[PDB]
Amino acid sequence: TTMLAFRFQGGIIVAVDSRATAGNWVASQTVKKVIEINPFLLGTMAGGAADCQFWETWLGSQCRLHELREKERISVAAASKILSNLVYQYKGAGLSMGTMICGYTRKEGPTIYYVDSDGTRLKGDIFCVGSGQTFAYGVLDSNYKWDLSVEDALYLGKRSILAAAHRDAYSGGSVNLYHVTEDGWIYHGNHDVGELFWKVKEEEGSFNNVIG
């Protein structure tokens, strides 16, 4: 698994891979690791598939109840904390979760919280989680700027997952892209890694080690 999310001038880019493994066995290449909590909030899924799916869907229900009661969009701070407080109650029982709660509100701007099953809740600009996180960080760190365009930011996220998908055995399948704006998230397609790799190799001149 490889997922990243980073803040920039135009909001947030979320990029994930699509592979699921049960040992060496590749169970799926078409897994949705981004969860559409609601039209404004996204969550990433690492660790326990069910734990992430179940509780971030539940989170969407809590966010909906909040805005019904308060007549106002829930903050990313408040939404992330509902989830982190919940998993903290279960600490020790064996939940496995590594997620980035991503959103864009008026009062906060673009915001990302890394939330984790041992109770961690961290606000930050760039996060990368999963078995292939180190590969993606390398591409991110060397190319990241705040003043990236939406087009270049989307590509950077796509390219960073590709880096991980190549090297990490447990990452691959396809790349899912999202762009989070103040008016909500925008999906930017499913990209097969097989086809994407060759395309990027030729156009970019990278991966000279690999024969194509």
């Binding site: 982190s84 903290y88 890394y114 041992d118 109770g119 996060f127 996180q133």
Partner: protein, 195 residues
């Protein structure tokens, strides 16, 4: 978390805390502030198990803020430290204990004295001129034992603190990504933004 240091000088308490947050293989963040303001003249830094540190710190913060509002009065650093100790002493025999070590730096406005309290996750409290948690003391205490004076200025305290951090950066295997330094005195709490 890793390194938290404290030093009580003439007229203030200085807390230094590392900025790194490491989740196993990667350093996820290099600007983390491992501290909470409990009251205008009381600061608490913390280190221990992930999640429990912030949960405990914010829980304490909420309780002291509640007391402040109810009584329209700021508890003394001693009173706050005793409350914190009891919570940790209670916690150690719980089903799942808070694995959190803290330093409490406060300026007592009644006595006009700075005060530094060191409390570990067992509820072991000691008032000290300077303190630390984890391995931080192993590298820094020999320097503090040598140079420390009770009549030091805040600037001299910061210089002695720099020497401690330099020794840590030299001999510690882990990269803790520098420290955030905060000063607690009669005027309240402020952060040294260049260290």
């Amino acid at each position: 978390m890793d390194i938290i240091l404290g030093i009580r000088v003439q007229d203030s308490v200085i807390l230094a805390s590392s900025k790194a947050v490491t989740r196993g293989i990667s350093v996820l963040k290099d600007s983390d502030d491992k501290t909470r303001q409990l009251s205008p003249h009381t600061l608490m830094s913390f280190a221990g198990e992930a999640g429990d540190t912030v949960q405990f710190a914010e829980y304490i913060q909420a309780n002291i803020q509640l007391y402040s509002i109810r009584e329209d009065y700021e508890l003394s650093p001693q009173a706050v430290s005793s409350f914190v100790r009891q919570e940790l002493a209670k916690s150690i025999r719980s089903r799942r204990p808070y694995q959190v070590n803290v330093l409490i730096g406060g300026y007592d406005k009644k006595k006009n004295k700075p005060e530094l309290y060191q409390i570990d996750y067992l509820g072991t409290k000691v008032e000290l001129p300077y303190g630390a948690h984890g391995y931080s003391g192993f590298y820094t205490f020999s320097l503090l034992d040598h140079h420390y004076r009770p009549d030091m200025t805040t600037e001299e305290g910061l210089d002695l603190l720099k020497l401690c951090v330099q020794e840590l950066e030299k001999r510690m295997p882990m990269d803790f990504k520098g420290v955030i330094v905060k000063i607690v005195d009669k005027d309240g709490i402020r952060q040294v933004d260049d260290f």
